[PDB]
Amino acid sequence: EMVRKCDPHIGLLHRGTEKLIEYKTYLQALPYFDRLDYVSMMCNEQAYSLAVEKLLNIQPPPRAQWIRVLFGEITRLLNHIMAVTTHALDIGAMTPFFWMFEEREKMFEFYERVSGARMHAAYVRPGGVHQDLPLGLMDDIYEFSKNFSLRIDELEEMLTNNRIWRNRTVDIGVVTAEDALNYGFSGVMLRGSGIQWDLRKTQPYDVYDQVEFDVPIGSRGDCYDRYLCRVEEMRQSIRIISQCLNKMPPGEIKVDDAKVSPPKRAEMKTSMESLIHHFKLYTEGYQVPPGATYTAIEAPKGEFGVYLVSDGSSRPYRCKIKAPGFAHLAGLDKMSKGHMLADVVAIIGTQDIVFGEVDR
Amino acid sequence: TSVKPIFSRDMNEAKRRVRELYRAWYREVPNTVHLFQLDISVKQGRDKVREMFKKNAHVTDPRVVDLLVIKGKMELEETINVWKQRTHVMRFFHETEAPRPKDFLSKFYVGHDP
Amino acid sequence: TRPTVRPRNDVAHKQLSAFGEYVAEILPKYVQQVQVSCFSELEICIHPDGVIPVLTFLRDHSNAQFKSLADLTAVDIPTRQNRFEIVYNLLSLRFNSRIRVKTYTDELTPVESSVSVYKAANWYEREIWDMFGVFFANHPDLRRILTDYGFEGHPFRKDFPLSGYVELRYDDEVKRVVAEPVELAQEFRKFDLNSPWEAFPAYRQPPE
Amino acid sequence: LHHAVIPHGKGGRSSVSGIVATVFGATGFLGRYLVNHLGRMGSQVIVPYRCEPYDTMHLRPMGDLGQIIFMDWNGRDKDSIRRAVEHSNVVINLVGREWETKNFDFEDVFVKIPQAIAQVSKEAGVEKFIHISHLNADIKSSSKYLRNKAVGEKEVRETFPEATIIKPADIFGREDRFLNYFANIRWFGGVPLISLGKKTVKQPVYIVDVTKGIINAIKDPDARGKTFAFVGPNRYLLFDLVQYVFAVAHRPFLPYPMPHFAYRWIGRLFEISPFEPWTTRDKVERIHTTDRTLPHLPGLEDLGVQATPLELKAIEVLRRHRTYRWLSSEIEDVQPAKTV
Amino acid sequence: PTVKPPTARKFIWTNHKFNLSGTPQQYVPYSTTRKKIQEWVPPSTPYK
Amino acid sequence: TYKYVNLREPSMDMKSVTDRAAQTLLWTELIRGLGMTLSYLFREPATINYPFEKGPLSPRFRGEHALRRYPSGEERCIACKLCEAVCPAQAITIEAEPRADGSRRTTRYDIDMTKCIYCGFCQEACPVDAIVEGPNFEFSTETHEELLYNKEKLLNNGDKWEAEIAANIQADYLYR
Amino acid sequence: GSDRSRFLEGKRAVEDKNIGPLVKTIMTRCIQCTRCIRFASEIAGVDDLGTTGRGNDMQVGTYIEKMFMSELSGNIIDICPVGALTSKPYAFTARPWETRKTESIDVMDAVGSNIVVSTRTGEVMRILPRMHEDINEEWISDKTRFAYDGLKRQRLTEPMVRNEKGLLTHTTWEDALSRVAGMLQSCQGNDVAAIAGGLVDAEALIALKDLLNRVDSDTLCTEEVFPTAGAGTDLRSNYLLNTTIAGVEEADVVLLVGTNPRFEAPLFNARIRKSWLHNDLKVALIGSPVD
Amino acid sequence: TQLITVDEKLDITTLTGVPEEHIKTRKARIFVPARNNMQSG
Amino acid sequence: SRGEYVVAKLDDLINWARRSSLWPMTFGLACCAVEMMHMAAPRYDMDRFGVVFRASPRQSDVMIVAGTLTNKMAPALRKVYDQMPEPRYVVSMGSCANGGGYYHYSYSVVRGCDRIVPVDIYVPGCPPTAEALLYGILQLQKKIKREKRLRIWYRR
Amino acid sequence: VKQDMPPVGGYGPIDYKRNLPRRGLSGYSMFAVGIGALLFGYW
Amino acid sequence: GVRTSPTGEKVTHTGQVYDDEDYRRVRFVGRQKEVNENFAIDLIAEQPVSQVGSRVISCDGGGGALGHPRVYINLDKETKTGTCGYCGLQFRQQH
Ligand SMILES: NC(=O)C1=CN([C@@H]2O[C@H](COP(=O)(O)OP(=O)(O)OC[C@H]3O[C@@H](n4cnc5c(N)ncnc54)[C@H](OP(=O)(O)O)[C@@H]3O)[C@@H](O)[C@H]2O)C=CC1
Ligand SMILES: CCCCCCCCCCC1=C(C)C(=O)C(OC)=C(OC)C1=O
Ligand code: SF4
Ligand code: SF4
Numbered sequence A: 001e002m003v004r005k006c007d008p009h010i011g012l013l014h015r016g017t018e019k020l021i022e023y024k025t026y027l028q029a030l031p032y033f034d035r036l037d038y039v040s041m042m043c044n045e046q047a048y049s050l051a052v053e054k055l056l057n058i059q060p061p062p063r064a065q066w067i068r069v070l071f072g073e074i075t076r077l078l079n080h081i082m083a084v085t086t087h088a089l090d091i092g093a094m095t096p097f098f099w100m101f102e103e104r105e106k107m108f109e110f111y112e113r114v115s116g117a118r119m120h121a122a123y124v125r126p127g128g129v130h131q132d133l134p135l136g137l138m139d140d141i142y143e144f145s146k147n148f149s150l151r152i153d154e155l156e157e158m159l160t161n162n163r164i165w166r167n168r169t170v171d172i173g174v175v176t177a178e179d180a181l182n183y184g185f186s187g188v189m190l191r192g193s194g195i196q197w198d199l200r201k202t203q204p205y206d207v208y209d210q211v212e213f214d215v216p217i218g219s220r221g222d223c224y225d226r227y228l229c230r231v232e233e234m235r236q237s238i239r240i241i242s243q244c245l246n247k248m249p250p251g252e253i254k255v256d257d258a259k260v261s262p263p264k265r266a267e268m269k270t271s272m273e274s275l276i277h278h279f280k281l282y283t284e285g286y287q288v289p290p291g292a293t294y295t296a297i298e299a300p301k302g303e304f305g306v307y308l309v310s311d312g313s314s315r316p317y318r319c320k321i322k323a324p325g326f327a328h329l330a331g332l333d334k335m336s337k338g339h340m341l342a343d344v345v346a347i348i349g350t351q352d353i354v355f356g357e358v359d360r
Numbered sequence B: 001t002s003v004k005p006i007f008s009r010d011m012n013e014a015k016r017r018v019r020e021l022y023r024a025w026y027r028e029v030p031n032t033v034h035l036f037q038l039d040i041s042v043k044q045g046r047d048k049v050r051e052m053f054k055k056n057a058h059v060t061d062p063r064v065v066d067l068l069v070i071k072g073k074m075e076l077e078e079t080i081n082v083w084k085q086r087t088h089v090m091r092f093f094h095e096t097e098a099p100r101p102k103d104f105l106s107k108f109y110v111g112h113d114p
Numbered sequence C: 001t002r003p004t005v006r007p008r009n010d011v012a013h014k015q016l017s018a019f020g021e022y023v024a025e026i027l028p029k030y031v032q033q034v035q036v037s038c039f040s041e042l043e044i045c046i047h048p049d050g051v052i053p054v055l056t057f058l059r060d061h062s063n064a065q066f067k068s069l070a071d072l073t074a075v076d077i078p079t080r081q082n083r084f085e086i087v088y089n090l091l092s093l094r095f096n097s098r099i100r101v102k103t104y105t106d107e108l109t110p111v112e113s114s115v116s117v118y119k120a121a122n123w124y125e126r127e128i129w130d131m132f133g134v135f136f137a138n139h140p141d142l143r144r145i146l147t148d149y150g151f152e153g154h155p156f157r158k159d160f161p162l163s164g165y166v167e168l169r170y171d172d173e174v175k176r177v178v179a180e181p182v183e184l185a186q187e188f189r190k191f192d193l194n195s196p197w198e199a200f201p202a203y204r205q206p207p208e
Numbered sequence D: 001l002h003h004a005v006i007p008h009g010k011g012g013r014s015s016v017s018g019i020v021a022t023v024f025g026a027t028g029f030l031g032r033y034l035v036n037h038l039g040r041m042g043s044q045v046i047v048p049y050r051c052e053p054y055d056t057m058h059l060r061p062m063g064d065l066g067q068i069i070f071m072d073w074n075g076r077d078k079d080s081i082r083r084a085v086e087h088s089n090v091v092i093n094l095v096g097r098e099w100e101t102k103n104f105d106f107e108d109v110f111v112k113i114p115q116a117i118a119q120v121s122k123e124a125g126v127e128k129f130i131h132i133s134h135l136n137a138d139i140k141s142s143s144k145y146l147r148n149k150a151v152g153e154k155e156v157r158e159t160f161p162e163a164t165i166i167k168p169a170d171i172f173g174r175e176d177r178f179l180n181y182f183a184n185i186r187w188f189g190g191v192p193l194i195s196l197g198k199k200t201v202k203q204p205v206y207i208v209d210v211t212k213g214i215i216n217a218i219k220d221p222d223a224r225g226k227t228f229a230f231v232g233p234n235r236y237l238l239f240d241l242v243q244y245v246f247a248v249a250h251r252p253f254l255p256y257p258m259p260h261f262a263y264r265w266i267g268r269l270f271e272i273s274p275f276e277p278w279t280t281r282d283k284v285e286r287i288h289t290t291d292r293t294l295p296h297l298p299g300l301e302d303l304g305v306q307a308t309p310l311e312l313k314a315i316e317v318l319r320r321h322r323t324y325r326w327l328s329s330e331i332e333d334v335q336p337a338k339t340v
Numbered sequence E: 001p002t003v004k005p006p007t008a009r010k011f012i013w014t015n016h017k018f019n020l021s022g023t024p025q026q027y028v029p030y031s032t033t034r035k036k037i038q039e040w041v042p043p044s045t046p047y048k
Numbered sequence F: 001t002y003k004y005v006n007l008r009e010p011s012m013d014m015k016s017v018t019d020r021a022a023q024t025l026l027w028t029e030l031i032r033g034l035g036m037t038l039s040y041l042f043r044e045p046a047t048i049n050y051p052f053e054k055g056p057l058s059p060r061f062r063g064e065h066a067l068r069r070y071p072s073g074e075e076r077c078i079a080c081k082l083c084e085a086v087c088p089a090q091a092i093t094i095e096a097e098p099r100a101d102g103s104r105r106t107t108r109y110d111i112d113m114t115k116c117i118y119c120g121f122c123q124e125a126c127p128v129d130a131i132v133e134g135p136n137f138e139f140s141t142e143t144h145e146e147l148l149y150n151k152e153k154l155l156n157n158g159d160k161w162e163a164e165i166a167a168n169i170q171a172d173y174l175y176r
Numbered sequence G: 001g002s003d004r005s006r007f008l009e010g011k012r013a014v015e016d017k018n019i020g021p022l023v024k025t026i027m028t029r030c031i032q033c034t035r036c037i038r039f040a041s042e043i044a045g046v047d048d049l050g051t052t053g054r055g056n057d058m059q060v061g062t063y064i065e066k067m068f069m070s071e072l073s074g075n076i077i078d079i080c081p082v083g084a085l086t087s088k089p090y091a092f093t094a095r096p097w098e099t100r101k102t103e104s105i106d107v108m109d110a111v112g113s114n115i116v117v118s119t120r121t122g123e124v125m126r127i128l129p130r131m132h133e134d135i136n137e138e139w140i141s142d143k144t145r146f147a148y149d150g151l152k153r154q155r156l157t158e159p160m161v162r163n164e165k166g167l168l169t170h171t172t173w174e175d176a177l178s179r180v181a182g183m184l185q186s187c188q189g190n191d192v193a194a195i196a197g198g199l200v201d202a203e204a205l206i207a208l209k210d211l212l213n214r215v216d217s218d219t220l221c222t223e224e225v226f227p228t229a230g231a232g233t234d235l236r237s238n239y240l241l242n243t244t245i246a247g248v249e250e251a252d253v254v255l256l257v258g259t260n261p262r263f264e265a266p267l268f269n270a271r272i273r274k275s276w277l278h279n280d281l282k283v284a285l286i287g288s289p290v291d
Numbered sequence H: 001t002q003l004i005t006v007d008e009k010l011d012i013t014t015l016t017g018v019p020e021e022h023i024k025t026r027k028a029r030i031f032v033p034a035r036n037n038m039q040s041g
Numbered sequence I: 001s002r003g004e005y006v007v008a009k010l011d012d013l014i015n016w017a018r019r020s021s022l023w024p025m026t027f028g029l030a031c032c033a034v035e036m037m038h039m040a041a042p043r044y045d046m047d048r049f050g051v052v053f054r055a056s057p058r059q060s061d062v063m064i065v066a067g068t069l070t071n072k073m074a075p076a077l078r079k080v081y082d083q084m085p086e087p088r089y090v091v092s093m094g095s096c097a098n099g100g101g102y103y104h105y106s107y108s109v110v111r112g113c114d115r116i117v118p119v120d121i122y123v124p125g126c127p128p129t130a131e132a133l134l135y136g137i138l139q140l141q142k143k144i145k146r147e148k149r150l151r152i153w154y155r156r
Numbered sequence J: 001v002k003q004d005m006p007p008v009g010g011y012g013p014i015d016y017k018r019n020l021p022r023r024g025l026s027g028y029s030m031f032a033v034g035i036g037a038l039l040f041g042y043w
Numbered sequence K: 001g002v003r004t005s006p007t008g009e010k011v012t013h014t015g016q017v018y019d020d021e022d023y024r025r026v027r028f029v030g031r032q033k034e035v036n037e038n039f040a041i042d043l044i045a046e047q048p049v050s051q052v053g054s055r056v057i058s059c060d061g062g063g064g065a066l067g068h069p070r071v072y073i074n075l076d077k078e079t080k081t082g083t084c085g086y087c088g089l090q091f092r093q094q095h
């Protein structure tokens, strides 16, 4: 049972997403991104949206940037509930899975209220978001965030000081810093090893320079410091949601360049130019200027990037999707050396893999 | 016309690599019939290997046959290690497919393809 | 142009232009172009014989320290005689910066594998073998990574169609999943969407 | 010819083969592979089913969407038969039982229901009707199966004169009751045989040969009104046939003579079960009936079907009956049986 | 709807139906268009 | 702006050493975990009694598709094919011609529900609010081809669910 | 243009017109660009379109219920930049993003007009012109544009043979080719001939010519009579438009003899009118006094 | 050296994985697409 | 007759015991398995219906194909379905398992799992909600309830 | 206008830190209880 | 106003019905052909022609942003009514 070689064959979920993106327009290529990291949906939407907006040379309105960061931290809570609870389920603590998926169910209700779908919203779009917040949503987000800390507290009560949880994760999967940078790791996989790097601080996007939070830094590079980094990122995500609920500005939620974002339906049915722009944006779409960008954001699994190549047409020429899980699952073979099967399952837990973004 | 090689300087080393690869497949086929428990004879699998080698027998470019040796070694590694299954090995035996119309008359009868 | 237009970061544009001059004059053996985009991204277009000399520079040079390999990508552009465009995306955590190192190959020229510089590429260029057909010389374990095991052809080449040449189904005669030639019950409806009117005069090419 | 039934496409799963088939008894051994080989051509297959719809589940992935229409039918009800055949351009008859049940006998299965299906298909305008008899069908045969199947062949020929009536010898496949039957007398004892099984000769035919024969009889206009005899290429005595079965499966083959008056008492001992019986005296009479030679009838070679011998498909059938200690041995690691 | 009734129409179903899948009242799909190419009808007279 | 998770050194006076030794020998954190699990034993579970109790939904919810009509009986779909031009999976197939009064209407309006990705681009691209993605989500079938809706099935979905779709559009249409 | 409206007023509604069964007219969409009038005045030579009115009530039309029936009357559907002049048979049927544009040739006349057949899901939707400076500059006749719906009626789809009662019945290809070749094997010499039609490509022509040459038959005819007295069809110069279609732009005097080129070869007549208009061509006609 | 002299014709048909039916029996059409006469651009 | 009544009540007993003790298997593929975990979550709670996972195919009763079936895993799907003892059932969850879905025209995707396994219940959505999946499971229970196994045995 | 907005004074303070409340006895008390139970059982 | 073919099969509002000799009726055997009996072409004839006193009228179908885009309809022809392109509601100038 001592592991001598790991060969993870992948591509069992290779759907050929980023060839299907080439034959569809940018708005049609947006819902492919929801299904890559399918526990981090609006973060992938936000990364693709920032890539398209960077090529379009336009910026979102401020309220849509605050809504993007609010639902990005809700999305980070979703992914870290998934990560921690299924890592513990794959170790054996199967009960806080059931404890935290009710909270995850409530955040899926928040998605279903703001966008109409529980998981795959196609809500965060190039130009802002699709639709404004419904009335009464933010008060329920406050009533959720008021109580979520007790849930993190009781998860941390069940696992953090537990000796059986420590004996499965403390000497397991140690990653040195130079081999972490060499393997192209990102996110918690660096931050468990002590590499002070977070793209919401260092290379900040929409309004992450306007919210103050902390970045948890691990000390031993093991599964247990990465566990504590994910629990503390749930804490800090509650902190950023408090700051975003207090600091939500009024205004619109799409870019008012109506050759990019569609007009309202109240003005599409009255104005001529708005009808022409609605027609041409929902059939041809907006033309992105030629050029290539690499826009990467801090998704809750790490550096999630889009390398987007446009040829001036209304469709992408190339769209490479850099996932963190690809490089993390590459480094699995080094991380699993000297361990056993019951430790390699903890290593695959602490490398939180969603294979839709690993395989595309 | 001054190009960079992959492995072979010319066609002699290239034919050496094709020859070694056919040696490796010829040694491999009885194990492939045995541990995949294929219901074909060993001669039938060796003739399929000979058919898959004679299919590419018209190439005169050393780089292309270097890549064919490379891809054949990749399929050989997928066959030695049990990474293919019984389906992936029997996909070289197009058995569920109908015999396509060969002459002009039956292709005329069934459809429009030349 | 304040609310709806992206603001321009001229400081990062100037800094990346100066570092592009720096890299172009340190390594003129391989560096072909250096260009800085309007949203301040740097591209070092090199020769495919300088993969290992340039990337070991940017991994190790004390003014570069691009210690992270973000992404490795090929792009098929069939109208060039070297139709594949290998793209190295690099992150310097010291200088909080990103760089792009682009090179080129056709189907038959090997590109030297950059696993000696960044081990992260051990799967990425492996994927470039799987998706595009670019062979990487002196790679440790080069095989397919995403396609099916008996998959012929290279998917992300633009001469390869969207649906492939085969499709799978279960067959109860042979009790086995079989591959047949693909027949769609509905053809993928190709939409001609390009407008005949020019959208961007600044990107206008000269005529013949 | 109607415009919706013109053959289009390249003969794949989603194509239009122009064949609208009502396959009676498609939930069995021949109907499995028949609906397989039809639905891969892109045919509209109507499957009337008597059984549970769960027992029809394996017929659902065999074709494209809407190409297999399941519908209820009763053999003692012409209304459901006319409900099934009224749109088809070919009806295939695969209704059969090796044993007679509480409500059905061999005359209901082989004389009543096939004449009903052929008569209703005649009076609904179905051009092509395929009936499946047995090669050893005879009025004076010792087994009630072959007697009622000869009577049913006569009735189908007289009430549908353009019918293609097909004679298979003894069909083997994965789901057969011929090589599996010969396998499963390592449970009971030492595989008893009438006169050591050396006074009867068999030429068993492979099931995909029979299936390609049925489909090439559908596509052939010259197969209308013929009578085909589908036999395998090699004739075997029953002794070395059973010896080759027990040599592929690597079981201890120790035969012994059981007389004719006592090997029917074993036949009535297993047909007193209310379930599907393990054997019967009719199966005793038909394992020990020689496969007759009818050279005047056309065969698989006259429909373009190359007959597959037993030494290619017997490993495919009989790998299931092996123990682990000889489970992975090959097709060539056995001496073939002696032909005649 | 006892307090805020729905907006009544002439086409809204007065008889709501539950899920009919598996029953003889189930949806069977079909092409909702007519025949595209009209075929030639040969004349019903002798050519002599 | 960063914090060190797990950089605590334990106290080495005899009091804290005896406290950790009692924690080790007498299993204090194990009793803490048992206490938290026993605390959840005595709670009301979140299990709603499906099918009698339903999960809460919004008037933005995207379920089964339906073709709407004007409040006179006339259907809304004027064959403009924006819904199949923006459909990210090409689930919508439209064939049209002028009908017997010269009106621009469809003869074929097919939605393949087994290609459909339920993202609602068709209901936001429709200029006349004809195609919508209504509130029904309990429409599982026992056969694949029952999930290939023609124009008749979609108009019957509209006629079935109109008394709810009109109210949900009335609740949401100012946000659109 | 801009992306929104400052127009907070009520729009006009222009009355629709009826100028034929070919051109659906919705004049509210008209932007008064007068490509109608310049086309019908300068290329079609009709002089029956115009602008009646003055100011915002200026209406492009004919002022009366007059039907715009030229042989080129549908080309105003091409050069209407808005949807005020649409193709009435094509109307409401398809949409140009989903149409597949296959570049092909006319066969409705001997002009050989370059066209785009645009289809949709395996069904021909419409026929547009291609640009070609030497044939049809970017126009086509109304027959070329609108005869594609005869291409989907009265079609031959299955091989038919005479039954025993003397009626055409459907049969397979094997029966039809056997019954034709069985009579072809009993013919030899001038016992077998061949009439070539109007719409038959050169591949089928040389196919049937080689087939009847295998029977040793040279009796192969076409429906249109060309006289063989003299050099016949041996030299190519005595049956071609040897100047060119484009050579009318180089000519100064044209003698038309025994023809109505308006309806026999309409875009050749359009090239003659373009030379008449711009190059001061002198045209003389021997024949009936046609327009 | 580190370069070889290949005078052979460039042909990668055995590498692209296309079946023979779509190599030898297809006719590629190379053309500038004609201007849609519905538009002026 | 009495025997028809006895086999009818025994059909009712075995259909009750099979629909009220459905054991699905821990088998998801893509985003639908997250929602299938939400159908296991304490709000919708499959376990109150007797619906509980068993990881081995030998001790599972239904296979919920929850996600996208690619070409590289279709033989693994078929062998996992084959290693389930009869009676075994298939619930197809989501658009990619139903008919190819959002990756329908892809080179690498099996266009619906009904090309591979016989499918009983098609659950539509991208993803279908956990409530819609539980609706499909209860419709599968209603399909098991009206099975006529021993009646058809008694009549054949 | 009407829009989903925070209230005028903002939302309330939200807890986001660790609260593991340090319950239980000390070490010497639990060993005293255990040794006393031993002595009672032994007597 | 749904009608019925001589096969017994109902005719859709398109005009679709399978022929008697068409095998594809077998999909409706034992099951039902789902047609919608509320024909829009029948239900728009039931609407009264709106008599107005203006020359150019406007239609948005009702609801404002709940209907269709607002088009402007000319009522100059005293012979023909003025039909909306979207809703099919027809108008007439009453003089
Ligand atoms: N080796 C062989 O088995 C040979 C067989 N044949 C003939 O070929 C035909 C098919 O053979 P095979 O598949 O092996 O046999 P099976 O018994 O396995 O198949 C019979 C089929 O008919 C149905 N059926 C049986 N009895 C009745 C009945 N009384 N009423 C209605 N349906 C019924 C069965 O379905 P259900 O689930 O409803 O019972 C099944 O689909 C038969 O006519 C047989 O005589 C000929 C030569 C050799
Ligand atoms: C016991 C609690 C319910 C578990 C139900 C698991 C059913 C199978 C889902 C597949 C799956 C597994 C195993 C899984 O562990 C996982 O990781 C979070 C997934 O998402 C990427 C999965 O899709
Ligand atoms: S919801 Fe999306 S995928 Fe479904 S029909 Fe509408 S546009 Fe297409
Ligand atoms: S967008 Fe609306 S009106 Fe247009 S074709 Fe689609 S459903 Fe019909």
Ligand code: SF4
Pocket (backbone or CB within 6 Å): G029, G030, G031, G032, G033, G034, G035, G036, G037, G060, G079, G080, G081, G082, G084, G085
């Ligand atoms: S071509 Fe069109 S826009 Fe121009 S005048 Fe004529 S109708 Fe008006």
Ligand code: SF4
Pocket (backbone or CB within 6 Å): A276, G029, G081, G082, G083, G084
């Ligand atoms: S498509 Fe053009 S002509 Fe038609 S209504 Fe719109 S702007 Fe006017």
Ligand code: SF4
Pocket (backbone or CB within 6 Å): A035, A038, A120, I030, I031, I032, I033, I066, I067, I068, I093, I094, I095, I096, I097, I101, I102, I125, I126, I127, I128
């Ligand atoms: S049907 Fe859609 S949402 Fe569901 S698993 Fe598939 S890709 Fe994900």
Ligand SMILES: [K+]
Pocket (backbone or CB within 6 Å): G076, G077, G078, G079, G080, G081, G082, G083, G084, G085, G086
């Ligand atoms: K026009």
Ligand SMILES: [Zn+2]
Pocket (backbone or CB within 6 Å): K059, K060, K061, K068, K084, K085, K086, K087, K088, K089
């Ligand atoms: Zn209106």
